[PDB]
Amino acid sequence: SPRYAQIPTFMRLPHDPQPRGYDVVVIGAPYDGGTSYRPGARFGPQAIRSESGLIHGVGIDRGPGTFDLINCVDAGDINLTPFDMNIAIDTAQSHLSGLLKANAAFLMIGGDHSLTVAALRAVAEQHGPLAVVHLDAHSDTNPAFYGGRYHHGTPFRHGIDEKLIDPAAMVQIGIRGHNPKPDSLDYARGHGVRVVTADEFGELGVGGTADLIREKVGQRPVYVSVDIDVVDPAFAPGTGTPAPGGLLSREVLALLRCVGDLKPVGFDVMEVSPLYDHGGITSILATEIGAELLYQYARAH
Amino acid sequence: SPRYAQIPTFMRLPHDPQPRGYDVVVIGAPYDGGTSYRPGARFGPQAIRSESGLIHGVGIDRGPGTFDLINCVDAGDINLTPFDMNIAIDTAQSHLSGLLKANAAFLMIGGDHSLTVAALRAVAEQHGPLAVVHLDAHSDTNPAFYGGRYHHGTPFRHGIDEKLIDPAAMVQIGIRGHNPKPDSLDYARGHGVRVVTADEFGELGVGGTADLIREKVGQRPVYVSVDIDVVDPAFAPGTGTPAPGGLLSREVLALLRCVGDLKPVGFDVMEVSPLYDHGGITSILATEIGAELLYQYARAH
Amino acid sequence: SPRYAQIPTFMRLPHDPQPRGYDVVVIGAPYDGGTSYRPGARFGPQAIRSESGLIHGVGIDRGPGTFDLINCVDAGDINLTPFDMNIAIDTAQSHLSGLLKANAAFLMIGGDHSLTVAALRAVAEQHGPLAVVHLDAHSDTNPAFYGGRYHHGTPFRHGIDEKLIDPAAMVQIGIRGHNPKPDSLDYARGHGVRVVTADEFGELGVGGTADLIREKVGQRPVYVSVDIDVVDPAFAPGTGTPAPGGLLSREVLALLRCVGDLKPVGFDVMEVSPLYDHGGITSILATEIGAELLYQYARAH
Amino acid sequence: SPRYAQIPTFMRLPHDPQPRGYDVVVIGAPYDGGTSYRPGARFGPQAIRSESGLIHGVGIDRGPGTFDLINCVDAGDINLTPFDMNIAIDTAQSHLSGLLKANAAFLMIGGDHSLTVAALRAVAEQHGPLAVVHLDAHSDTNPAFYGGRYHHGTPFRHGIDEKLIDPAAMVQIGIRGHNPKPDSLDYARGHGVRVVTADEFGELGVGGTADLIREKVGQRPVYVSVDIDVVDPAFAPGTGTPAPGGLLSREVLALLRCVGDLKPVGFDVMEVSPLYDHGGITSILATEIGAELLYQYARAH
Amino acid sequence: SPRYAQIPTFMRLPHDPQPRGYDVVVIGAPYDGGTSYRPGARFGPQAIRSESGLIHGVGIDRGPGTFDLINCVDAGDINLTPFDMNIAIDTAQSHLSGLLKANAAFLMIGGDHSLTVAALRAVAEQHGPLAVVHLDAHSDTNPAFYGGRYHHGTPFRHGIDEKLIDPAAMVQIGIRGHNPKPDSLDYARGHGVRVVTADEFGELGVGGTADLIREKVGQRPVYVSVDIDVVDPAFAPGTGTPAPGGLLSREVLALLRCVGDLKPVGFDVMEVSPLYDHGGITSILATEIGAELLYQYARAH
Amino acid sequence: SPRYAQIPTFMRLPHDPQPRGYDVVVIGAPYDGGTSYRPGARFGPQAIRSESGLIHGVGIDRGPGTFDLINCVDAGDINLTPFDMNIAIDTAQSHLSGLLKANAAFLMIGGDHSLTVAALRAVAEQHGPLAVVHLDAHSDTNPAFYGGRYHHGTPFRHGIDEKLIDPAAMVQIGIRGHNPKPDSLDYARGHGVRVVTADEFGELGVGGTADLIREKVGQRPVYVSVDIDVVDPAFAPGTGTPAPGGLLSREVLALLRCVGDLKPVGFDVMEVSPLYDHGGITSILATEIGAELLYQYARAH
Ligand SMILES: [Mn+2]
Ligand SMILES: [Mn+2]
Ligand SMILES: [Mn+2]
Ligand SMILES: [Mn+2]
Ligand SMILES: [Mn+2]
Ligand SMILES: [Mn+2]
Ligand SMILES: [Mn+2]
Ligand SMILES: [Mn+2]
Ligand SMILES: [Mn+2]
Ligand SMILES: [Mn+2]
Ligand SMILES: [Mn+2]
Ligand SMILES: [Mn+2]
């Protein structure tokens, strides 16, 4: 049976709009109301599902395969309105919380990074202050404002302010490019957030960074949020705010292997904007990233 | 609830892999093993479903809307192998026949036009020799050959040879471009098939051609097969064998309105090849064509 | 001096962010917060300006050329936020009103059609109830709702409700496809709006429709709003909600010639979404449409 | 044998870099040194050859097929430098003249329209003042200037000035858009050139225009020059200077049928710029146009 | 003479459909009947030839240039049917064997990787059991099946089973992603095939892997088969089954330098699918890879 | 205020066609008359400006931000004719010299690399023989010829011949691929130019190469010329002559940091050809490169 046949689900997992009893639920968040530049992330879930036919759960020289170790399912998407930022975030929180009431954790395949604040609220409600591993070209700890409380640059600002995240246990890797202001990282650092710029990542290497993550996160429940623009635009051209000089696909995938040494309670892959993608390579990468996280979840439990 | 949200089905119809009791079942045939030039029609069903979110059943100044008049469903796709032409055609016939055992008719959204021979066999088995309305830039009545019994240029040749079609009640509109040989249409015409070239269509007009169809088809059970390349490449660039100087989108959609004055027992929309499409306009058109046929089915019954 | 050289302005007109004393000001509205399906119209103004280098004011066998008859300028764009629908509409109204305080009229090159409610408010404030010529594939007279008061399907609903438009003097041409509900046009018609579907347009022809417009509009001050999706997706693939079976580019351009026989007090060209465009043909067409309106403005005065 | 197999030649004709004894030689002119806006026409010959696999010489209900009536061949390309306008034009003239020394006529598949002056010089040298049928969205009778003697807007200006063309026997169809100056057509008309704008073409129709051509050309040796941008950008997006509101593909192809009633001594299809093409539909159309001209040549002799 | 001028051949080499006496013949295999996901590799030969204009034989600081050291030619393509897998493979074998009867070796630029079994049969027939250097993201040693004996995942399975390859002298580099089953590599390894995953390649480095190849291949006649998907999708997006986290272009090109220390008797570059390519960079890379192999052939002899 | 709003200028800097008193003026050179293969670089300035909205002057953990340290402005473009190579180069020289008469230095965002000879003449006229840091995949020190005195392969040949450059103080990094002749680098090396091939760059590393630059350039006034094709086609597909196996985006950006330790008197970023770009990633990279140079200029002064 061809992998491009049949209605597309993430990695061809079974479909269940009202999942109950699974370890990890894959949930789509087709929304880009938080994008400040290029929109289009609302089609991310659809594109990612479409290309995921090429990725299975069986790695290489790994065990029996992710899906034989844990029970996963594709719960469809959250009905997020494209007309009201505040309403969409609340709907997201509500939906994500609902999932956690009957399932261990979820993997959000979405639109812009702003939606992560909803995930953090839902996950923190069930585990308490969370440790965070954030892969992004941008810090996403910028101030909100009137008529723009949830732009995709505020997710982790809210997380820290709302005590959803324990800054002393948060590490963001890949920061590069330009800050909106010269003292934009003072906030995150002042709160104890460990910032690893793309430059330092190059000095530390994958192993070095992996050790740093393990040391800063420990065994606290951790949320892994991945902004697709963390990798260089060459590997992920389909995104809203590309930033030249990013990580290689293999570097990111290799790094994520350390997640298996932690206690992940949730993750997401955001900012995929299909329209700007070339040959669907961004969606395919996004899929591979999701697959690696799902497998690491299994290894960790 | 946004139309781009949730797993995509044709026109967002309910999904049921084993449909029973419906008037018309939408079935995908993701296969391009019959394409002689550009492949890719295997992704047609997926692309068409994806863009169909923009098309509803409620026309304009029409009745209550197609889906309140008849019961339709998206039965997913036929598992067609991309490795063996003969096996795929048989699988298609078997699957399509299965659908007719518990449902009135089907609408095949597929890959290349070769698959239509399987539909004709399935439909003819339940209604006897069929009347045919074929929209295509090519006659598709060419000879088969060893190692290529079912290339997309043979569907209606088999239909006539196998007595699945009553040539005296077959009309193909839109023929233009180039025949493989100077006497290529002698076969169809010798059998009594009415050929209306794109040129003559221009002289007859939509109404004139509609009258011709009604007169040649009468009230016999009719199968309506539409090759997307019937319209000019400008309106449908996403197809395997484009042919300049074709019909306008509106001309084809207007023409299909006459189907409501007949007794349709099945139809298909083939040759959509997404990779060559621009802005998804081909898939969107293909969707609109399917919607018009579904509505005409309702009007006819 | 090459037309692709120098910072791009609409039709290479002079730039003046705070214009005063001109006949017609070209103003960009880079916003798509009202789009219900495909976003991207926020880049419309930029793309349209970019490709406008190919279009001059000198027609063919026309007079001395549009720009020697009237004084026009490119006023840049309105700073429209992508984070709040209500705030963007108010900012648009305010900015457009500002322009009318020192200039005769404006030509809004924008994002989604929802922004037209802001233009109608600004224009109506200076001329009173307006006559309207609306070219669109959709009526855009649908009900608003909580958390979505200004989706691009509500502009003319608000116009009528707010008494900004005199329905008895409004004509919309090109309607086709699907209404959200079977009784969706009852509203517009009940108010006396003349609806000319793409089908009727075909029967009436350009001349017939032009006479109808002149008769229904008279000499009342008229606002001409053009949704790029009025033309078939083949001619304008770069738009948010394509609708197959639309008008030909030449048909729309020819029709707009009748504007010179009226008293235009404003116009706009909306819904151009560059990302879905092919070869920039949509932006080029949008430019030509704007040029024709500017010229007709001159002819009318 | 698949049509996409083997090194590509125009319509899969035999290849012969030094042809002798043929009726019509297909020659490529990969050059865009004359383009004033979008470059890229230098790849036109290559793209056109590539897609020509879909077009044969056997029409529909026509005779035995073009290639059984006349002997044609693909002579490869003229080595045209992209660094010097004047040198390229001379090289073109020299090469084209060489072809005519041993073959009846040629079909130039090229780059920008400026190259036609070289063809006119070569053909006029063997037949004397020529009658001309020019299909273009622009008159191409603009003044040359220092450092730009051969921009693609000067071909027919030179033709008339150099007495290569008999203006009283020249007809250009499709003119639309914008003239560089309000009295830009005075030159052509003053010389007796019959200008049929896209607008008038609509009034005259294909038949009416065909009669006009026959009447104005008579039996004088005629050169048929076709600028691909004569058709609307929707049908030919792959060109340097698109002009909205153009002819339909079928209109142009139908019109060219009248060439068979004349005495054609040469023709060309110019301005195809592949990079801006969508789905290769422009190259495919260009191919079909060349095929129709080749067939009409045969019919005329 | 511009490199984009004249009918395109691989690296602008002379053309000869029936070559005799050359060292290396470049032969195209326009076929994708073995692709299991995205088709399109049938256009690989054409696209690769088209872009090869940018690559010459003269390296940098290398000797006199590849083409002055050995005699190469472009033999056109093998007429491979797109309708029957088994017939195409036999035709390929027959054609490739024919070439070896009068020429030293060949470089197959093709479609999907399944075609390599035909090359292995032809080469093994003249040299006996072969040593193999296989660059691919997938092992291609999967089981065949009824109605799919030659899908692109079976080439090296057949090679070993048919004794065309000496597994103890086979090395495949770049394996990554997902195996169809958790014990999928047991077969290759059980036969003594050295598998170097993309991960291990990173540890070994180019030099380390080069030493490993030299040691495992020795001086036995070796066939070098390169699947374009061995490099990360960012460098080669135009392929049927992309696999994130692949090698860098420079890594692969640098690695291939070790071929000059072996005794190459044949090579191929497969899976290039132009439709999914961006800016032709995949075809350009494929060309550069072919050039490096040709040069290494010369160095080795 | 959205960054995609308002007429686009490089990095949203103020616009001033006749700048006076600034430290660095950003000037566009929309010209590709020197391209030998793919044209299109004439749209480079426009595309780069368009995407530059994403890049600010405020780096990360850097000082107050580039634009608070120095005064920069976007001077628009040089009116370069696309019809005459020699005239365009002279116009460029004249315009660039004019800028230097009232501003410290300029950053040329242009078309093909041939234009750099004009910049070198203008800069050398005010500083004397210049030291040069050239990043390119090609040496660009090839011989000129009649009818092609300024093809993009001659810039640095002229620079040395005309004594505008002090070869003993010139370093070009990234050379790879193919030389037109086996002894093509003898010229540059014979003059004392330090050539660092992409291969050697890999051995030296960023730091090693940075030291080499500092040592070979010293404190002499230096011109930094960057050909976008220096990075692998994966990172910069939008260019005229791609060369596989190039540098990573981060490698080039990191390397340019050493410019701050020198005395830069001018720089340029050339060969960006938008049409071949994917997701605008080439233009975005080009922007980032320009930003880094501007910042390093500030650091150096
Ligand atoms: Mn983010
Ligand atoms: Mn980010
Ligand atoms: Mn067909
Ligand atoms: Mn067809
Ligand atoms: Mn609208
Ligand atoms: Mn609309
Ligand atoms: Mn022309
Ligand atoms: Mn023209
Ligand atoms: Mn393979
Ligand atoms: Mn592979
Ligand atoms: Mn260069
Ligand atoms: Mn270069």
Q: Three-state secondary structure along D144-209?
A: CECCECCCCCCHHHHHHHCCCEEEEEEEEEEECCCCCCCCCCHHHHHCCCEEEEHHHHHHHHHHHH
List phi, psi (to 5°) of C115: -60, -20
Give start and end residues of each alpha helix (H) in C70-115. Answer: 85-102
Residue linked to tokens 């690989």: E44
The answer to the question of whether B136 is labelled as a binding residue is yes
Report which of D212, D215, D127, D216 is spatially closest to residue D169, judged by C-alpha positions.
Answer: D216
Distances from the Cα of F104 to the Cα of D147, E6, F23, angstroms = 32, 48, 5
* Ligand number, closest to the Cα atom of C175: 6
Report which of C152, C89, C151, C116 is spatially closest to residue C266, judged by C-alpha positions.
Answer: C116
How many Cα atoms sit within 13 Å of E56 on the Cβ side?
A: 17
Q: Distance between CA atoms of A241 and A238, rounded to whole angstroms?
A: 9
Kindly give the distance from the C-alpha atom of residue F32 to the centroid of ligand 12, in angstroms, as a whole number. 13
How many Cα atoms sit within 13 Å of C241 on the Cβ side?
A: 30
Residues in F touching C74 (Cβ below 8 Å): 7
* Ligand number, closest to the Cα atom of A176: 2
Using N-to-C axis directions, what is the helix angle for C44-51 and F44-51, rounded to 10°? 170
Q: Hey, how many other C-beta atoms are within 10 angstroms of the C-beta on A145? A: 11
The answer to the question of whether A138 is labelled as a binding residue is yes
List phi, psi (to 5°) of B206: -65, -50
How is residue A106 written in tokens?
A: 């979820």
Residue C271 Ramachandran class (φ > 0 left, ψ -120 to 50 alpha, else beta): left
Residue ranges with CB less than 5 Å from ion ligand 7 = D 113, 136, 140, 227
* Ligand number, closest to the Cα atom of F154: 11
Q: Is residue B6 within 8 Å of residue B88, measured between CB atoms?
A: no
Q: Distance between CA atoms of D80 and C163, rounded to whole angstroms?
A: 65
Cβ distance A37 to F281 less than 8 Å, yes or no, reads no
Q: Hey, how many other C-beta atoms are within 10 angstroms of the C-beta on D14? A: 12
Sheet containing strand F165-175, strands side by side: F72-77, F24-29, F105-110, F263-270, F221-227, F130-135, F165-175, F194-197
Cβ distance A37 to F64 less than 8 Å, yes or no, reads no
How is residue F242 written in tokens?
A: 């791609």
User: Which of residues 180 through 219 in chain C touch B, CB cutoff 8 A?
Assistant: 180-182, 185, 197-199, 202
Q: Which residues contact B200 (CB under 8 A, 6 or more apart)?
A: none
Coil vs helix vs strand at C294: helix
How many Cα atoms sit within 13 Å of B194 on the Cβ side?
A: 19
- The DSSP symbol for D20 reads -
How is residue C219 written in tokens?
A: 């000499």
Tell whether C153 is within 8 A of chain A (Cβ): no
Q: Distance between CA atoms of D299 and F7, rounded to whole angstroms?
A: 55
Q: Distance between CA atoms of D162 and D120, rounded to whole angstroms?
A: 10
Where does residue E213 rank: exposed (0-12), middle (13-18), buried (19+ CB within 10 A)? buried
Cβ distance C7 to F4 less than 8 Å, yes or no, reads no
Three-state secondary structure string covering B246-281: CECHHHHHHHHHHHHHCEEEEEEEECECHHHCCCCH
List phi, psi (to 5°) of D109: -105, 110
Q: Which long-range contacts (CB under 8 A, 24 or more apart) does C206-213 make?
A: C206/C251, C206/C254, C206/C255, C209/C173, C209/C255, C210/C255, C210/C257, C210/C258, C212/C171, C213/C133, C213/C171, C213/C173, C213/C255, C213/C258, C213/C262
Q: Which residues contact A30 (CB under 8 A, 6 or more apart)?
A: A42, A43, A44, A45, A46, A77, A78, A80, A110, A111, B2, B4, B5
- Which of D2, D42, D77 has the CB atom closest to E6's CB atom? D77
List phi, psi (to 5°) of A153: -105, 5
Kindly give the distance from the C-alpha atom of residue F152 to the centroid of ligand 11, in angstroms, as a whole number. 6
Question: Quick one: closest CA in C to F82, which residue?
Answer: C2
Cβ distance B82 to E276 less than 8 Å, yes or no, reads no
Q: What is the DSSP string of C144-204?
A: -BTTBTT-TT-HHHHHHHTTSEEEEEEEEEEE-S--SSTTTTHHHHHTT-EEEEHHHHHHH
Q: Tell me how close the Cα of A150 comes to any Cα of chain E, in angstroms.
A: 32
Q: Distance between CA atoms of F169 and C292, rounded to whole angstroms?
A: 58
Q: Hey, how many other C-beta atoms are within 10 angstroms of the C-beta on B69? A: 18
| Type of residue at E68 | D
User: Which of residues 30 through 59 in chain F touch C, CB cutoff 8 A?
Assistant: 30, 42-43, 46, 49-50
How is residue C220 written in tokens?
A: 């009342």
Cβ distance A147 to C84 less than 8 Å, yes or no, reads yes
Three-state secondary structure string covering C203-270: HHHHHHHHHHHHHHHCCCEEEEEEEHHHECCCCCCCECCCCCCCECHHHHHHHHHHHHHCEEEEEEEE
Distances from the Cα of D154 to the Cα of C135, D36, D114, D244, E241, angstroms = 38, 11, 6, 22, 50
Q: Is residue B75 within 8 Å of residue B25, measured between CB atoms?
A: yes
How is residue C238 written in tokens?
A: 């770069």
Residue B192 Ramachandran class (φ > 0 left, ψ -120 to 50 alpha, else beta): left
Q: Is residue E85 within 8 Å of residue B86, measured between CB atoms?
A: no
Q: Distance between CA atoms of D71 and F152, rounded to whole angstroms?
A: 42
- Reported resolution, Å: 2.5
CA-based R_g, chain B, Å: 17
Q: Which helix (H) or strand (E) holds B175?
A: strand B165-175
Question: Quick one: closest CA in F to A186, which residue?
Answer: F61
Q: Distance between CA atoms of D97 and D94, rounded to whole angstroms?
A: 5
How far from chain centre, in Å, is Cα D129? 18
Q: Which helix (H) or strand (E) holds D231?
A: none
The answer to the question of whether D95 is labelled as a binding residue is no
- The number of residues making up chain E comes to 301
Question: Quick one: closest CA in F to E255, which residue?
Answer: F245
Residues in E touching D49 (Cβ below 8 Å): 7
Report which of A228, B56, B45, A49 is spatially closest to residue C37, judged by C-alpha positions.
Answer: B56
Q: Distance between CA atoms of F31 and F42, rounded to whole angstroms?
A: 4
Residue linked to tokens 């729309």: C252
Which of 2.40.37.10, 3.40.50.170, 3.90.950.10, 3.40.800.10 would CATH assign to domain C1-301? 3.40.800.10
How is residue E211 written in tokens?
A: 């030493």
Three-state secondary structure string covering chain A: CCCCCCCCCHHHCCECCCCCCCCEEEEEECCCCCCCCCCCHHHHHHHHHHHHHHCCCCCCCCCCCHHHHCCEEEEEECCCCCCCHHHHHHHHHHHHHHHHHHCCEEEEEECCHHHHHHHHHHHHHHHCCEEEEEECCCCCCCCCECCECCCCCCHHHHHHHCCCEEEEEEEEEEECCCCCCCCCCHHHHHCCCEEEEHHHHHHHHHHHHHHHHHHHHCCCEEEEEEEHHHECCCCCCCECCCCCCCECHHHHHHHHHHHHHCEEEEEEEECECHHHCCCCHHHHHHHHHHHHHHHHHHHHC
How is residue A182 written in tokens?
A: 């010269």
Q: What is the DSSP string of F177-202?
A: S--SSTTSSHHHHHTT-EEEEHHHHH
Touching chains C and E? (3+ Cβ pairs < 8 A): no
Question: Quick one: closest CA in F to D40, which residue?
Answer: F39
The answer to the question of whether A183 is labelled as a binding residue is no
Report which of C26, C78, C29 is spatially closest to residue C55, judged by C-alpha positions.
Answer: C26
Coil vs helix vs strand at F21: coil
Q: Distance between CA atoms of B22 and C179, rounded to whole angstroms?
A: 25
Q: Is residue D22 within 8 Å of residue D101, measured between CB atoms?
A: no
* Ligand number, closest to the Cα atom of F226: 11
Q: Distance between CA atoms of D162 and D166, rounded to whole angstroms?
A: 10
Report which of E2, E14, E40, E8 is spatially closest to residue E270, judged by C-alpha positions.
Answer: E40
Residues in B touching C36 (Cβ below 8 Å): 2-3
First to last CA, chain B: 32
Q: Distance between CA atoms of F114 and F32, rounded to whole angstroms?
A: 9
Distances from the Cα of F268 to the Cα of A104, B28, B279, F196, angstroms = 55, 54, 36, 20
Q: Is residue D29 within 8 Å of residue D45, measured between CB atoms?
A: yes
First to last CA, chain F: 32
Kindly give the distance from the C-alpha atom of residue B248 to the centroid of ligand 4, in angstroms, as a whole number. 15
Nearest 10 degrees: CA dihedral of A213, A215, A220, A224? 0
Q: Distance between CA atoms of F178 and F184, rounded to whole angstroms?
A: 10
Q: Distance between CA atoms of E261 and E218, rounded to whole angstroms?
A: 9
Tell whether F89 is within 8 A of chain D (Cβ): no
How is residue C131 written in tokens?
A: 């006559």
How is residue A212 written in tokens?
A: 């740093």
How is residue F23 written in tokens?
A: 């430290």
Cβ distance E53 to F36 less than 8 Å, yes or no, reads no
Residues in B touching E82 (Cβ below 8 Å): 35-36, 39
User: Taken in order E79, E82, E87, E88, is the CA torsion positive or negative?
Assistant: positive
Chains in contact with chain B (at least 3 beta-carbon pairs closer than 8 A)? A, C, D, E
Distances from the Cα of D278 to the Cα of B45, E238, E272, angstroms = 21, 17, 21
- Which of F34, F82, F147 has the CB atom closest to D35's CB atom? F82
Q: Distance between CA atoms of B179 and B198, rounded to whole angstroms?
A: 14
Q: Distance between CA atoms of D250 and C248, rounded to whole angstroms?
A: 14
Report which of D175, D139, D179, D188 is spatially closest to residue C64, judged by C-alpha positions.
Answer: D179
Residues in E touching A284 (Cβ below 8 Å): 233, 242, 244
Q: Distance between CA atoms of B110 and D121, rounded to whole angstroms?
A: 53
| Residue of F54, F228, F289 best to disrupt the A interface, most CBs of A under 10 A | F54
Report which of A202, A207, A154 is spatially closest to residue A176, judged by C-alpha positions.
Answer: A202
The shares of helix, strand and coil residues in chain B, as percent rounded to the nearest 5, are 40, 20, 40
List phi, psi (to 5°) of E21: 90, 5
Residue linked to tokens 């005075």: D186
Q: Which residues contact F99 (CB under 8 A, 6 or more apart)?
A: F19, F25, F27, F75, F106, F122
How far from chain centre, in Å, is Cα E162? 19
Q: Which residues contact D58 (CB under 8 A, 6 or more apart)?
A: B178, B179, B180, B181, B182, B184, D64, D65, D66
Report which of A58, E139, B176 is spatially closest to residue D288, judged by C-alpha positions.
Answer: B176
Q: Which residues contact C94 (CB under 8 A, 6 or more apart)?
A: none
Q: Hey, how many other C-beta atoms are within 10 angstroms of the C-beta on A239? A: 31
Q: Which helix (H) or strand (E) holds F246?
A: none
How is residue E243 written in tokens?
A: 């696999």
How many Cα atoms sit within 13 Å of E192 on the Cβ side?
A: 12
- Which of E2, E58, E278 has the CB atom closest to F182's CB atom? E58
Cβ distance A49 to B7 less than 8 Å, yes or no, reads yes
- The DSSP symbol for B150 reads T
How is residue A267 written in tokens?
A: 């993750």
Q: What is the DSSP string of chain E?
A: --TTSSS--GGG--B-SS--S-SEEEEEE---TT-SS---GGGHHHHHHHHGGG--S--SSSSS-HHHHS-EEEEEE----SS-HHHHHHHHHHHHHHHHHHSSEEEEEES-GGGHHHHHHHHHHHH-SEEEEEE-SS------BTTBTT-TT-HHHHHHHTTSEEEEEEEEEEE-S--SSTTTTHHHHHTT-EEEEHHHHHHHHHHHHHHHHHHHHTTSEEEEEEEGGGB-TTT--SBSS--SS-B-HHHHHHHGGGGGGSEEEEEEEE-B-GGG-STTHHHHHHHHHHHHHHHHHHHH-
Q: Distance between CA atoms of C41 and C44, rounded to whole angstroms?
A: 5
Q: Is residue F65 within 8 Å of residue F59, measured between CB atoms?
A: yes
Q: Distance between CA atoms of B171 and B134, rounded to whole angstroms?
A: 6
